Coordinates of C-alpha atoms in Angstrom, one line a residue:
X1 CA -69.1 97.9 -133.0
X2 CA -67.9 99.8 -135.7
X3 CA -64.1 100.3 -137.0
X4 CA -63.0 103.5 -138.5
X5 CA -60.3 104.3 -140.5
X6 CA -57.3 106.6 -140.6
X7 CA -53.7 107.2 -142.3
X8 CA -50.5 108.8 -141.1
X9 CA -51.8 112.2 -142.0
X10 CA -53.3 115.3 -139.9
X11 CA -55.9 115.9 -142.6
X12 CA -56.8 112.5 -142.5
X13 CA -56.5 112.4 -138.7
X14 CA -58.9 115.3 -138.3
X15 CA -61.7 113.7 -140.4
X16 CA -61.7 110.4 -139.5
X17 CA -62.4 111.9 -135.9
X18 CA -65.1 113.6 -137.3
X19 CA -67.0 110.7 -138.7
X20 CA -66.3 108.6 -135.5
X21 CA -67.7 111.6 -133.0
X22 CA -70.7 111.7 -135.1
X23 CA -71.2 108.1 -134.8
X24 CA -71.0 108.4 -131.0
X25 CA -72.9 111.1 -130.3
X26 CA -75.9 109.7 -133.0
X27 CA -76.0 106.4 -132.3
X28 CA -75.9 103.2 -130.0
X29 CA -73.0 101.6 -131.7
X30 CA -70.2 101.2 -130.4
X31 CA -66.6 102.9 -132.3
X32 CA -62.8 102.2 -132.7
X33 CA -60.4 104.4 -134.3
X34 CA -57.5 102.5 -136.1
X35 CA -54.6 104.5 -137.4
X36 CA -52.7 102.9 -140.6
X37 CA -49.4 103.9 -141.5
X38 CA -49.0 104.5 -145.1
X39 CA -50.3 106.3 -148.4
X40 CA -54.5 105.6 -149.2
X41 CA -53.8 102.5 -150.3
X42 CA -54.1 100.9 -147.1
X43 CA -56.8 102.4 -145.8
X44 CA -58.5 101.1 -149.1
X45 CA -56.7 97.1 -148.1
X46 CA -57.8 97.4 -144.7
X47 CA -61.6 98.3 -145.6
X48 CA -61.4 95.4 -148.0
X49 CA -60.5 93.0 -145.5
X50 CA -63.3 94.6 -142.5
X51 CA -63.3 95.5 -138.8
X52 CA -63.6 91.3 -138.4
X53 CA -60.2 90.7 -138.9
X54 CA -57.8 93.5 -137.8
X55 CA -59.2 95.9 -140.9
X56 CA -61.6 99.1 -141.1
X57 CA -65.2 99.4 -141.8
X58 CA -65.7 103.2 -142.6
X59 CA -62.8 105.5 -143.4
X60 CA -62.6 109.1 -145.7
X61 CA -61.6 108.4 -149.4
X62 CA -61.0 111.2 -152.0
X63 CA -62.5 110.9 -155.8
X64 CA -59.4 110.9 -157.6
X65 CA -57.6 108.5 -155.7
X66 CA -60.8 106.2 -156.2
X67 CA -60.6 106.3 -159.7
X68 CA -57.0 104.9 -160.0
X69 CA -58.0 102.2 -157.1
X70 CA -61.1 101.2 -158.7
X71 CA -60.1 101.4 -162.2
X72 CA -56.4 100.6 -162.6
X73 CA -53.4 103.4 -163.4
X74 CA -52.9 104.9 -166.2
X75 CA -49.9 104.3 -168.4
X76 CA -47.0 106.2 -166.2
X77 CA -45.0 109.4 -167.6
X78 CA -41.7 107.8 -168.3
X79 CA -38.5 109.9 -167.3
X80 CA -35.8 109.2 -170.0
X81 CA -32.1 110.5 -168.3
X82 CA -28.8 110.5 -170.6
X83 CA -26.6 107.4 -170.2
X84 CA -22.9 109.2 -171.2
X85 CA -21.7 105.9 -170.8
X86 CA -24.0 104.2 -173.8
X87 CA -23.7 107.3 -175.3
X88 CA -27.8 106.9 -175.0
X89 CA -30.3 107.1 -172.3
X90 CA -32.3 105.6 -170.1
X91 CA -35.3 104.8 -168.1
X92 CA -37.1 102.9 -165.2
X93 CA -40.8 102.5 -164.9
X94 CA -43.5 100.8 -163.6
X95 CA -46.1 99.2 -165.7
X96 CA -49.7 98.2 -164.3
X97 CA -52.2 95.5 -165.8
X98 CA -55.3 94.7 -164.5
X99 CA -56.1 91.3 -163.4
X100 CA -59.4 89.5 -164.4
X101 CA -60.0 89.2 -160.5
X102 CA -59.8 92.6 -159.8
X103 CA -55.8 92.9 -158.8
X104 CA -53.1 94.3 -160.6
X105 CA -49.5 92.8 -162.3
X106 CA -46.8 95.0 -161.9
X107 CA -44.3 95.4 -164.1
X108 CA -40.8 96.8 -163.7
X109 CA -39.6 98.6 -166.9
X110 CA -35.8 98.9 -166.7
X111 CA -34.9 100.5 -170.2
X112 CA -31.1 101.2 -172.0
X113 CA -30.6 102.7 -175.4
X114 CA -27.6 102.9 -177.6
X115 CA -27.4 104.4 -181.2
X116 CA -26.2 102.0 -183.8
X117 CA -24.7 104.4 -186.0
X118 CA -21.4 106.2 -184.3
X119 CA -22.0 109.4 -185.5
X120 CA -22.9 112.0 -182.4
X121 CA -26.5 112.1 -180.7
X122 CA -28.7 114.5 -178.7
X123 CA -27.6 113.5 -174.8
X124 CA -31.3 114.8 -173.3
X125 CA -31.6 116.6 -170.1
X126 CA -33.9 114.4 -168.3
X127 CA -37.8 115.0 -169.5
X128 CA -40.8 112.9 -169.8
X129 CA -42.8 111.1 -172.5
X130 CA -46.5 110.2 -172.4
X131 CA -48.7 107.6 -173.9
X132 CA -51.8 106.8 -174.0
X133 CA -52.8 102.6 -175.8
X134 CA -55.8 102.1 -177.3
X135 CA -56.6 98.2 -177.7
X136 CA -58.6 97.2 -180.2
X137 CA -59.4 93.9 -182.4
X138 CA -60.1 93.8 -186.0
X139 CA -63.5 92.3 -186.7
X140 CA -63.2 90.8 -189.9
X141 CA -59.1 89.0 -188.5
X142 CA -59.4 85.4 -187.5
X143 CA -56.2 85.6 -186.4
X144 CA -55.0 86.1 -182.6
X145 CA -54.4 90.0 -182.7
X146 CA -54.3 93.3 -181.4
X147 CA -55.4 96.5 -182.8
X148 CA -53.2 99.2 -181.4
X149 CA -53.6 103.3 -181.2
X150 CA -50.9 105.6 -179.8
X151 CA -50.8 109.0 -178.9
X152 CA -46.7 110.0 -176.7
X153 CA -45.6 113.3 -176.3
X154 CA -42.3 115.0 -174.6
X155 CA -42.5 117.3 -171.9
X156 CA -40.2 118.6 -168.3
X157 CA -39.5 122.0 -169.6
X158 CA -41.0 125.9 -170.1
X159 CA -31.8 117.5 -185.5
X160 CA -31.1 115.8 -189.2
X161 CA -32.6 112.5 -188.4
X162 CA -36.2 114.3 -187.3
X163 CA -36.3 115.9 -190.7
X164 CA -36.9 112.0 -191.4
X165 CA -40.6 112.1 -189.1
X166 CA -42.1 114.9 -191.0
X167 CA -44.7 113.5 -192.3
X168 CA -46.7 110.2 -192.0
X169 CA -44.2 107.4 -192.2
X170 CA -44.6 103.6 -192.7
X171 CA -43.8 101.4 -189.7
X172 CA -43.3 97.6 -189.7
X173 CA -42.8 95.8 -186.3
X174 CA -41.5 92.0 -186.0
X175 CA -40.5 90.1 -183.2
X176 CA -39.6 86.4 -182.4
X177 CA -40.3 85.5 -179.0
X178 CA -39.3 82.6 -176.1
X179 CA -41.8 82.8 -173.0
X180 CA -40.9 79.2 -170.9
X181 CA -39.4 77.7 -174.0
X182 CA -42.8 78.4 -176.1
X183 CA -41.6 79.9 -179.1
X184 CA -43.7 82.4 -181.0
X185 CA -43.8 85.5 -183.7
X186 CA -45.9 88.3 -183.9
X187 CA -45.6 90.5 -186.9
X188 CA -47.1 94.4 -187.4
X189 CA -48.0 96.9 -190.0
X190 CA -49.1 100.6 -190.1
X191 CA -48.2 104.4 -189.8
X192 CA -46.8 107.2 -187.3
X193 CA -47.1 110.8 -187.6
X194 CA -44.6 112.5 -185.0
X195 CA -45.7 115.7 -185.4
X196 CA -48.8 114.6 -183.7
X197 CA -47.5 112.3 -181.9
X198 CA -50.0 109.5 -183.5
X199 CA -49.2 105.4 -183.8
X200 CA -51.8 102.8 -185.7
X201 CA -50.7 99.6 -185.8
X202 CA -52.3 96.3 -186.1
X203 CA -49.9 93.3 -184.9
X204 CA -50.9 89.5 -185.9
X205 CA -49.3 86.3 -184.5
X206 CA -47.8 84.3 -187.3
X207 CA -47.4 81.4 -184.8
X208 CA -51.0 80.7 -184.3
X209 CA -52.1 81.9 -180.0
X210 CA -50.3 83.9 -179.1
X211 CA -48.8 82.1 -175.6
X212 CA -48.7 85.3 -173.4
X213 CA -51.6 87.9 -173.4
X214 CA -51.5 91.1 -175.8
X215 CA -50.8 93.7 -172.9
X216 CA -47.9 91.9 -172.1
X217 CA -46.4 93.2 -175.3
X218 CA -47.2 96.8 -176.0
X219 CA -43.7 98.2 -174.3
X220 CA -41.9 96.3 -176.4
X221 CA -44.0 96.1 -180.0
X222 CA -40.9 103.2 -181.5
X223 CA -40.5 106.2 -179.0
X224 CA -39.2 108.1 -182.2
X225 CA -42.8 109.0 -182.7
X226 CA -43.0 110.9 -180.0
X227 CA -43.9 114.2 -180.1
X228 CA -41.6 116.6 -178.8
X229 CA -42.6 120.4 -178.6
X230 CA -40.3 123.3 -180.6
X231 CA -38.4 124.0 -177.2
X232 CA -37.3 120.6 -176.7
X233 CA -36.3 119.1 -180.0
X234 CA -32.9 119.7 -178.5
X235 CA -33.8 116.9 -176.3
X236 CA -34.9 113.9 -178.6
X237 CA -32.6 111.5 -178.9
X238 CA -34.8 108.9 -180.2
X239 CA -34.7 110.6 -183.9
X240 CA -31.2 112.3 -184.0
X241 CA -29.9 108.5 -184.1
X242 CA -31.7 107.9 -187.3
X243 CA -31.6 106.9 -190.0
X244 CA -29.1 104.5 -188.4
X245 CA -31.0 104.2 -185.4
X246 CA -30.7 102.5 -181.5
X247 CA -30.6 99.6 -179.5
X248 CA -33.0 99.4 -177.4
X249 CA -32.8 96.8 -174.2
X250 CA -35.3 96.4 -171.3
X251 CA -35.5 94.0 -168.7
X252 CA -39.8 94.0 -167.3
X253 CA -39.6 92.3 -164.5
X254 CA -43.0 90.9 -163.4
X255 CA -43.8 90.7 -159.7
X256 CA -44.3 87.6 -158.1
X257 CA -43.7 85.9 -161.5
X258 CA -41.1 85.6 -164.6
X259 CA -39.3 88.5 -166.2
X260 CA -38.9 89.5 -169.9
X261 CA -35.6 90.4 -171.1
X262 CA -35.5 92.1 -174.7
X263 CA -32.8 93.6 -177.5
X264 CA -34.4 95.6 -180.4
X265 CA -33.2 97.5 -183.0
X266 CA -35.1 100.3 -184.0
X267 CA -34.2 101.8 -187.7
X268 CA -35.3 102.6 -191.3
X269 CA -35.0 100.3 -194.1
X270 CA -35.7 102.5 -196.9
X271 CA -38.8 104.4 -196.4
X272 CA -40.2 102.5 -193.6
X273 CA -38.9 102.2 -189.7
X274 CA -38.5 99.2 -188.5
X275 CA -38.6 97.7 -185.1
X276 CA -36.8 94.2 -185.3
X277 CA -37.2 92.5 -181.3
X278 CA -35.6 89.5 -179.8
X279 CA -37.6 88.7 -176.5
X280 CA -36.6 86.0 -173.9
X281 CA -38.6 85.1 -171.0
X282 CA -37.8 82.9 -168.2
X283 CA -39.1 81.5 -165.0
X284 CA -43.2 82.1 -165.8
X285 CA -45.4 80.0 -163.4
X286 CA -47.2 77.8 -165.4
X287 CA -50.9 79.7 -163.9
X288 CA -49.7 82.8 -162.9
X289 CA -51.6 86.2 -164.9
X290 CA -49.0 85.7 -167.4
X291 CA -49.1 81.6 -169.1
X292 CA -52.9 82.0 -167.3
X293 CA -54.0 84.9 -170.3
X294 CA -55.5 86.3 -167.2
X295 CA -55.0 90.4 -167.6
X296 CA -57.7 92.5 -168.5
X297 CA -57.0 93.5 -172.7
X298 CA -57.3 97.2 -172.1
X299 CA -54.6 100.2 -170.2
X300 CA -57.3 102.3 -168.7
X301 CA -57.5 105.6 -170.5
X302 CA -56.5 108.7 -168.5
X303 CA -59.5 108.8 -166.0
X304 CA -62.0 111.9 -165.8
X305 CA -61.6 114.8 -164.5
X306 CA -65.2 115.9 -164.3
X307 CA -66.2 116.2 -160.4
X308 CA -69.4 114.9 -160.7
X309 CA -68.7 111.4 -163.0
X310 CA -65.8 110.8 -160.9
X311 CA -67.4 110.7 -157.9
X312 CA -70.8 108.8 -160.0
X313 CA -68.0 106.5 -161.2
X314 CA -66.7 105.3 -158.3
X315 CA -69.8 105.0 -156.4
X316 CA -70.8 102.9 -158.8
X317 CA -68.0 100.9 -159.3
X318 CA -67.0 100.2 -155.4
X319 CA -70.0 99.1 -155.0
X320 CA -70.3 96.5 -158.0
X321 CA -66.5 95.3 -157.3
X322 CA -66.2 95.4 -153.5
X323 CA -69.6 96.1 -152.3
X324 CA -68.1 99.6 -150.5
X325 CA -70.8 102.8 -150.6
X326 CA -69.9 106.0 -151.1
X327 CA -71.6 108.6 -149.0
X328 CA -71.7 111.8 -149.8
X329 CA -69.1 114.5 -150.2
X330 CA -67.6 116.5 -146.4
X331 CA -66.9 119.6 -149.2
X332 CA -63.3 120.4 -149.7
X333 CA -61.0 119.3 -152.3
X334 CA -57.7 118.3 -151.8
X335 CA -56.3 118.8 -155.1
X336 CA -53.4 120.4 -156.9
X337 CA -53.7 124.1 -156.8
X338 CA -52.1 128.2 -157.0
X339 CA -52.1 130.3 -154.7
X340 CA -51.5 133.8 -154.0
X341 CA -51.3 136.4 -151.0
X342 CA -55.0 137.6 -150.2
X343 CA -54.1 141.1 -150.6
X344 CA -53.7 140.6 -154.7
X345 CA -56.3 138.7 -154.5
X346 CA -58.5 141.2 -153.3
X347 CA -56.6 143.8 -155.6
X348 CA -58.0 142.6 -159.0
X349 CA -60.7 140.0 -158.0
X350 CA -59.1 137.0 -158.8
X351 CA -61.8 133.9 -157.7
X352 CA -60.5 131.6 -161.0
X353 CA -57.1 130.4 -162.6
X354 CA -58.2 132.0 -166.1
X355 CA -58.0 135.1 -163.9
X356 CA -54.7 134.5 -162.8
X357 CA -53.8 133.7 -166.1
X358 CA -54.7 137.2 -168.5
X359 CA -51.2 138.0 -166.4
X360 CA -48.1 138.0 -167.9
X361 CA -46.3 139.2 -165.0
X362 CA -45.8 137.6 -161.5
X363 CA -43.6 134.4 -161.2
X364 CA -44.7 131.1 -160.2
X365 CA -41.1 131.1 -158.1
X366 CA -43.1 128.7 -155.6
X367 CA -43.7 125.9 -157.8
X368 CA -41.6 122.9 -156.6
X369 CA -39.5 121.1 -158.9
X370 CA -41.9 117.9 -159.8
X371 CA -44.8 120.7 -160.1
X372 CA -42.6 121.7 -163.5
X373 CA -41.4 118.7 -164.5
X374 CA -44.3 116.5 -164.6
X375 CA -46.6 116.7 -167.7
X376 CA -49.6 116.7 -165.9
X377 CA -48.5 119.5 -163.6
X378 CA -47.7 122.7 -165.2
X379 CA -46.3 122.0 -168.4
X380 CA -50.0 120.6 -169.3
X381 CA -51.1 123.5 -167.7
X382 CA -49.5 125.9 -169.6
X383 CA -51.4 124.3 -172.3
X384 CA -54.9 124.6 -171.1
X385 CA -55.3 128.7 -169.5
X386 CA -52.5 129.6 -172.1
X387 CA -49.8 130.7 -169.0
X388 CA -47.3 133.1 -169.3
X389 CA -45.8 133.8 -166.6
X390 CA -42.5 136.4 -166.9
X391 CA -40.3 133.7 -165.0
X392 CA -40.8 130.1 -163.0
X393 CA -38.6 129.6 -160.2
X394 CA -37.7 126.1 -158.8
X395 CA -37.8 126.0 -154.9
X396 CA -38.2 123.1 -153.0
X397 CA -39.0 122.3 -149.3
X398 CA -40.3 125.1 -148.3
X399 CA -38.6 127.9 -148.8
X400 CA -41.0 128.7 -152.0
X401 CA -43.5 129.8 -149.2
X402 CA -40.8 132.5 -147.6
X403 CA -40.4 133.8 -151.0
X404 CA -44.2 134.8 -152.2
X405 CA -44.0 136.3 -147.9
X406 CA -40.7 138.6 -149.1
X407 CA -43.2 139.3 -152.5
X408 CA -40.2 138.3 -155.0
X409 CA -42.9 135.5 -156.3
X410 CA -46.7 136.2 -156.3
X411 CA -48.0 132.7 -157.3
X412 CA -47.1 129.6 -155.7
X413 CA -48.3 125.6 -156.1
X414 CA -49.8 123.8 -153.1
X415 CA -52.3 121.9 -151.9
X416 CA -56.0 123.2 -151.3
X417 CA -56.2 122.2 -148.1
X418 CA -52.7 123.0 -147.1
X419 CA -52.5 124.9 -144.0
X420 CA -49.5 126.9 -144.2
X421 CA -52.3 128.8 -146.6
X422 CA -53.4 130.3 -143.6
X423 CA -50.3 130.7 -141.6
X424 CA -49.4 132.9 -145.0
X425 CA -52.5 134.6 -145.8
X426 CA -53.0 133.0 -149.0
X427 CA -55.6 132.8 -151.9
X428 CA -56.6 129.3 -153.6
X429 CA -58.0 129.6 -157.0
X430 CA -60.9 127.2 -158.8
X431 CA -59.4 125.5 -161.3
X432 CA -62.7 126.5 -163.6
X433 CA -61.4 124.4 -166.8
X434 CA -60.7 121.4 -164.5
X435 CA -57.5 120.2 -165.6
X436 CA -56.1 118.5 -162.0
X437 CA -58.0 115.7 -160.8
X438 CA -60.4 116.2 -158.4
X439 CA -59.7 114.7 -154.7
X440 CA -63.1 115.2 -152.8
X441 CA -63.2 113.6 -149.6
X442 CA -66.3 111.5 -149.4
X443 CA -66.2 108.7 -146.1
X444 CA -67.0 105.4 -147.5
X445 CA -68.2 102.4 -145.2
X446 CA -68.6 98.4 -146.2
X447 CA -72.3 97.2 -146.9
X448 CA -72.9 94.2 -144.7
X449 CA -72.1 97.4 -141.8
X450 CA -74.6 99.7 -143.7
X451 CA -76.9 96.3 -143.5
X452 CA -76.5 96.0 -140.0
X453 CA -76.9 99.5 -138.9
X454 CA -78.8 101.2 -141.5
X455 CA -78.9 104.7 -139.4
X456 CA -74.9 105.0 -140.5
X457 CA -76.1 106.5 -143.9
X458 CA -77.9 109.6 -142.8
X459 CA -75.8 110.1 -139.8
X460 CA -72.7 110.4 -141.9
X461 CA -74.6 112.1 -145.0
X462 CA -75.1 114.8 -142.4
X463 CA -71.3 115.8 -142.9
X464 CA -72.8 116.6 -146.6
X465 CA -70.9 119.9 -147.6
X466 CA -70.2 120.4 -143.9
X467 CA -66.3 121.0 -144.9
X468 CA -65.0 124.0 -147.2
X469 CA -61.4 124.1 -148.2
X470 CA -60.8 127.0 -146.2
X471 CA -62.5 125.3 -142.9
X472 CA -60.3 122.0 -143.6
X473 CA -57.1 124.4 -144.0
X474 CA -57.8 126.7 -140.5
X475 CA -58.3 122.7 -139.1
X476 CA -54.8 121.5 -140.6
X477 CA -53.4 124.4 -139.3
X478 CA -54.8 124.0 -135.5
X479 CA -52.8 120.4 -135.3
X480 CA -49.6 121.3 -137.5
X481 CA -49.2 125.4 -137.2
X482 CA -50.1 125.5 -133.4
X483 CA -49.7 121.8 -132.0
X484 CA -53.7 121.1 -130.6
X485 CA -54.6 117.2 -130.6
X486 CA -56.5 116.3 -133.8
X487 CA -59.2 114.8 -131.5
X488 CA -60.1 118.2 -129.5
X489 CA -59.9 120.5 -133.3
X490 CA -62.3 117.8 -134.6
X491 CA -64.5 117.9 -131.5
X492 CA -64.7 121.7 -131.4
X493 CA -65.7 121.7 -134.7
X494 CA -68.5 120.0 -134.7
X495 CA -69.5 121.5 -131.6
X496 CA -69.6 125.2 -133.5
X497 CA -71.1 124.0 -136.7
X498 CA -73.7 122.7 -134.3
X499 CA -73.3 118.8 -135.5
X500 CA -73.2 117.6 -131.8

């Protein structure tokens, strides 16, 4: 008896079907289909925990979601929003570190900043910064210490105090610190370039250990580095308060565990900018992650992007950690696309996105809002096929898709494997200089199953580029555009393609 595995989700609903009719029909064994309501993440609990006790022993993972499973988050893209009332702004965010076991700590970043000086500031329209942290150690430092490399930029659309970050500018960092009573310093040197968008620091602590771990301490150990590009300088805050500076205050609430509260001031004194910190923290069990030094000492970088080492990655990886395989790839690619009526596409052979982009005409009307706002959609886009598109439209829900119908916009965002694509008669284009992650669905099953019924491997590797995009978008379609049971679109399938 094996358990497959399923979320809330036609797409998922239609493949997970598919894997368990090819069980059936090529084997002895015997299989249950468990639905799971929720995002991936549970179907990636519930394999975890086995078809034993109440959890799944096979279910359909995509690449790019592996990645952030397997290897931890990335640093988020903080949103920064004006606070009239602090005459600043503001932020909340959600900070992940990797546990030695192979968990994670959150941490709730709730952020406030108030200029010190009381002359007026740039109140932002809400954007995003950002960063990526290199850790590091200093051979040749005896020390307890961290080596430290920044790069934060600006982004969310198409002042005196910056004249201050034109060049490379000295830094100095110093904080006293009370985690549980243990009272501590830390103490850091170096440079920032803003135009770059470039940090290098290297912090030391003056105390002797340093009695929470290094990670811990990165939020709070100069967002006036930031780069912000030339139609957004409007929006920086951070510098228009110097040289007087801000104030900045953040409670980081750790789950399951203490919280740090901090005040900083954030200024220059002379030539150099300072970052002067007060940090209190309370209520820390005495071995949790935290007093424990157990978090891993390195934010994963942004992961790859490359479809082949993502997928070698994770195989790899799941199998050393949780002692999951990976089979191999069903095809399609759920991923972050454009798309455009067939017609045009036809009309000047347009197969790739540097295609789509030699045109300065068309909108991209359909893109919906977060689409425009977030870096990594098409604001980092923009910087990678050089898009120039006459105008970009927000429209949300889904009225974007009655627009590009009516022809006012002739490029839209979506989903690969969306399957309004077909109810619309619409063109997906290869993203040929890979800047979205890539999402293909690969089913993934628990070794001690693939032990016990070794014939699962080749059965299921028989689904091996079985599933285009434009098959998995006629099959979406079937169950959400004209109300067939996942179970019967699945079966037919396989039945045409000649699987069963």
């Amino acid at each position: 008896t094996v358990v497959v595995g399923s979320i809330n989700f036609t797409e998922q609903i239609i493949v997970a079907n598919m894997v368990a009719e090819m069980i059936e029909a090529h084997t002895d064994l015997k299989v249950v289909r468990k639905l799971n309501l929720g995002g991936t993440n549970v179907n990636f609990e519930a394999i975890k925990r086995g078809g034993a006790n109440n959890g799944i022993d096979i279910y359909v993972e995509y690449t790019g979601t592996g990645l952030v499973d397997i290897l931890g988050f990335p640093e988020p893209n903080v949103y920064i929003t004006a606070d009239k009332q602090k005459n600043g702004i503001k932020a909340n965010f959600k900070i992940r570190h990797n546990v030695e076991d192979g968990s994670v700590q959150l941490a709730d970043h709730y952020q406030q900043n108030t200029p010190i000086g009381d002359g007026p500031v740039l109140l932002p329209d809400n954007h995003y910064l950002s960063t990526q942290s290199v850790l590091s150690k200093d051979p040749n430092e005896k020390r307890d210490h961290m080596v430290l490399l920044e790069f934060v930029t600006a982004a969310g659309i198409t002042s005196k105090g910056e004249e201050l970050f034109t060049g490379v500018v000295p830094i100095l960092v110093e904080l006293d610190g009370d985690v549980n009573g243990h009272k501590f310093s830390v103490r850091g040197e170096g440079e920032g370039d803003a135009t770059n968008g470039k940090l290098t620091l290297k912090f030391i602590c003056t105390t002797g250990k340093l009695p929470v771990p290094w990670p811990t301490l990165v939020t709070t150990l100069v967002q006036c580095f930031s780069r912000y590009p030339d139609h957004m300088k409007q929006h920086d805050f951070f510098k228009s308060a110097m040289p007087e500076g801000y104030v900045q205050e953040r409670t980081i609430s750790f789950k399951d565990d203490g919280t740090y509260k901090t005040r900083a001031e954030v200024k220059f004194e002379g030539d150099t900018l300072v970052n002067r910190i007060e940090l209190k923290g309370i209520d820390f069990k005495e071995d949790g992650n935290i007093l424990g030094h157990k978090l891993e000492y390195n934010f994963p970088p942004p992961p790859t992007t490359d479809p082949e080492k993502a997928y070698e990655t994770v195989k790899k990886e799941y199998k050393d950690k949780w002692n999951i395989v990976w089979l191999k790839p069903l095809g399609f690619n759920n991923t972050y696309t454009l798309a455009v009526k067939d017609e045009l596409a036809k009309q000047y052979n347009l197969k790739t996105f540097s295609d789509l982009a030699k045109i300065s005409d068309k909108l991209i009307l359909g893109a919906t809002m977060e689409f425009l706002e977030k870096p990594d959609g098409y604001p980092g886009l923009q910087k990678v096929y050089n898009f120039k598109f006459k105008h970009t439209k927000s429209m949300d829900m889904g009225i974007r898709y009655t627009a590009i119908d009516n022809n006012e916009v002739q490029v839209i965002d979506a989903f690969a494997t969306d399957g309004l694509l077909v109810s619309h008669k619409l063109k997906i284009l290869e993203d040929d200089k890979h800047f979205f992650p890539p999402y293909y669905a690969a089913p993934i099953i628990r070794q001690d199953v693939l032990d016990k019924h070794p014939e699962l491997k080749d059965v299921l590797n028989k689904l091996a580029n079985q599933i285009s995009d434009e098959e998995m978008q006629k099959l979406n379609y079937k169950v959400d555009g004209e109300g067939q049971d996942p179970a019967k679109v699945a079966k037919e399938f396989l039945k045409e393609k000649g699987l069963i």
